[PDB]
Amino acid sequence: PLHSIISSTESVQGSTSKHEFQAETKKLLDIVARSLYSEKEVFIRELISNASDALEKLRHKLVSDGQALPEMEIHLQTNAEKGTITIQDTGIGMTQEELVSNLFGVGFYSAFMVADRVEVYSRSAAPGSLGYQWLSDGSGVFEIAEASGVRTGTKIIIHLKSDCKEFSSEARVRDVVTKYSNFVSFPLYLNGRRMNTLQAIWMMDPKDVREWQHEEFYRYVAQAHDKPRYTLHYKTDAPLNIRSIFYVPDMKPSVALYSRKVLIQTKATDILPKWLRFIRGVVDSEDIPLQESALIRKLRDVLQQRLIKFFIDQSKKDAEKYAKFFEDYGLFMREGIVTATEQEVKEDIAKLLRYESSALPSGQLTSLSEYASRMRARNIYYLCAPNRHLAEHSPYYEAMKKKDTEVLFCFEQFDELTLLHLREFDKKKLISVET
């Protein structure tokens, strides 16, 4: 049951009126066509983005006016014989002035990366509007004429270059559409076949998202078959635009980067610190282009503090579940501590650490912070030993415990090396009893 909407109903009665871009705008357009994007296949991504925004603007308008909603879809068509690719949306259109003035608008001209000659038809959703044609061949000269038989919305016909004939093949185009636009907000059809199925749940309100939805999305982005033990839905506007979901896999030992439901990097290792590479999920942000590493540090630092705060707030909600989490992922937290350059970052990550104490029963864990909360009046004392009993009957502990202080217990060499590297936490110093 193929559902297609694209066909030839457009015609131009009169002649076109030739126009020419300014020298400056022409230099920018050629940049978009050659010097702006690394992947020439992303022109499909951009046009789908445009089509989607156009559909939203139309919907929001109709919903606001209380009017009924028409078919709101995005259609792509490939034609190998004619060597073309078409994309039409039933969104809000473009007026004549927008077909002239405009050139949103930048993403469209990205089509001239693979196009020698492009044909465009648009008609505003405004009642009593006229259809118009737009033509250009890559130079700074475009044509505009009044066209009839133009459906409300926008239809973009691209005539691919000689070495870009690949984008006229259904196989190639399906690959690209499912890569960058699997979460498009409107129904997307390719040659009559439905493509998009997935819902960008990170855009929703956290309270409205259902647990089975998180489970579905986790299995998609992490390509796993288990469930997540932790889920953080973080949305913010103040620092930067951020729509993200983070998962902690349930099993023991690649966050995606999106922009407005549009994929950018499947592997976004740089978005988070190296010690947080066990995290799975997605980060969506409008404040992102376009390798890359400029303002990314801003985001990477914002997410690091939110995730640290997250894991802290989790321990005080379920200390036992967090204990198992620490046991399973403490490796990454120790690594992060030692790896860190600045001291403040070390003590931040260290807030996630957990050890046993002399003032606490065996099996119960405490943080460095909870230790200092019980510090009377100087320093932080610890002792590394094979087990709890061997540490309790130790002479060094008997000397320390007999007088005043709570003493921490660690039972692995890597736990001791971590505290030694940390040198000091908060306003106190980490000191071994064997000294």
Ligand SMILES: Nc1nc(Cl)c2cnn(Cc3ccc(Br)cc3F)c2n1
């Ligand atoms: N699909 C779609 N829908 C709408 Cl409403 C708009 C508005 N601008 N653009 C981009 C664009 C397309 C053609 C030309 Br010529 C200039 C230009 F900026 C749109 N694309």
